[PDB]
């Protein structure tokens, strides 16, 4: 899994 917030 890969989750990325900006």
């Amino acid at each position: 899994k890969l989750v990325f917030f900006a």
Side-chain angles (χ1 to χ4, degrees):
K1 218 77 78 186
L2 185 72
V3 176
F4 194 97
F5 295 109

PDB file of all heavy atoms in Angstrom:
ATOM      1  N   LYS A   1       0.832  -1.200   0.000  1.00  0.00           N
ATOM      2  CA  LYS A   1       0.000   0.000   0.000  1.00  0.00           C
ATOM      3  C   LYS A   1       0.865   1.249   0.000  1.00  0.00           C
ATOM      4  O   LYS A   1       1.939   1.244   0.590  1.00  0.00           O
ATOM      5  CB  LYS A   1      -0.836  -0.020   1.284  1.00  0.00           C
ATOM      6  CG  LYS A   1      -2.244   0.499   1.081  1.00  0.00           C
ATOM      7  CD  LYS A   1      -3.116  -0.562   0.396  1.00  0.00           C
ATOM      8  CE  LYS A   1      -3.560  -1.628   1.374  1.00  0.00           C
ATOM      9  NZ  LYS A   1      -4.286  -2.719   0.671  1.00  0.00           N
ATOM     10  N   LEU A   2       0.351   2.328  -0.568  1.00  0.00           N
ATOM     11  CA  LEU A   2       1.073   3.591  -0.582  1.00  0.00           C
ATOM     12  C   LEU A   2       0.030   4.686  -0.498  1.00  0.00           C
ATOM     13  O   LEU A   2      -0.850   4.760  -1.355  1.00  0.00           O
ATOM     14  CB  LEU A   2       1.864   3.664  -1.890  1.00  0.00           C
ATOM     15  CG  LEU A   2       2.781   4.853  -2.067  1.00  0.00           C
ATOM     16  CD1 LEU A   2       3.971   4.743  -1.180  1.00  0.00           C
ATOM     17  CD2 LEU A   2       3.278   4.901  -3.518  1.00  0.00           C
ATOM     18  N   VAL A   3       0.110   5.477   0.564  1.00  0.00           N
ATOM     19  CA  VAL A   3      -0.813   6.562   0.798  1.00  0.00           C
ATOM     20  C   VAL A   3      -0.009   7.834   0.995  1.00  0.00           C
ATOM     21  O   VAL A   3       0.934   7.835   1.782  1.00  0.00           O
ATOM     22  CB  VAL A   3      -1.677   6.251   2.033  1.00  0.00           C
ATOM     23  CG1 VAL A   3      -2.588   7.416   2.353  1.00  0.00           C
ATOM     24  CG2 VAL A   3      -2.495   4.990   1.829  1.00  0.00           C
ATOM     25  N   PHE A   4      -0.390   8.914   0.343  1.00  0.00           N
ATOM     26  CA  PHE A   4       0.414  10.124   0.355  1.00  0.00           C
ATOM     27  C   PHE A   4      -0.519  11.323   0.360  1.00  0.00           C
ATOM     28  O   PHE A   4      -1.374  11.426  -0.521  1.00  0.00           O
ATOM     29  CB  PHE A   4       1.330  10.169  -0.881  1.00  0.00           C
ATOM     30  CG  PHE A   4       2.425  11.201  -0.806  1.00  0.00           C
ATOM     31  CD1 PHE A   4       3.700  10.821  -0.400  1.00  0.00           C
ATOM     32  CD2 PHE A   4       2.165  12.532  -1.054  1.00  0.00           C
ATOM     33  CE1 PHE A   4       4.725  11.752  -0.286  1.00  0.00           C
ATOM     34  CE2 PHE A   4       3.191  13.464  -0.959  1.00  0.00           C
ATOM     35  CZ  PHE A   4       4.455  13.070  -0.575  1.00  0.00           C
ATOM     36  N   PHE A   5      -0.396  12.169   1.384  1.00  0.00           N
ATOM     37  CA  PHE A   5      -1.165  13.385   1.500  1.00  0.00           C
ATOM     38  C   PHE A   5      -0.224  14.573   1.370  1.00  0.00           C
ATOM     39  O   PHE A   5       0.894  14.588   1.881  1.00  0.00           O
ATOM     40  CB  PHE A   5      -1.925  13.437   2.834  1.00  0.00           C
ATOM     41  CG  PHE A   5      -2.957  12.364   2.933  1.00  0.00           C
ATOM     42  CD1 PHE A   5      -2.812  11.297   3.776  1.00  0.00           C
ATOM     43  CD2 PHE A   5      -4.072  12.424   2.135  1.00  0.00           C
ATOM     44  CE1 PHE A   5      -3.804  10.327   3.845  1.00  0.00           C
ATOM     45  CE2 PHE A   5      -5.046  11.450   2.200  1.00  0.00           C
ATOM     46  CZ  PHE A   5      -4.898  10.389   3.028  1.00  0.00           C
ATOM     47  N   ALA A   6      -0.740  15.626   0.759  1.00  0.00           N
ATOM     48  CA  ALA A   6      -0.040  16.906   0.729  1.00  0.00           C
ATOM     49  C   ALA A   6      -1.039  18.056   0.916  1.00  0.00           C
ATOM     50  O   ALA A   6      -0.665  19.113   1.449  1.00  0.00           O
ATOM     51  CB  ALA A   6       0.667  17.026  -0.576  1.00  0.00           C
TER      52      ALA A   6
END
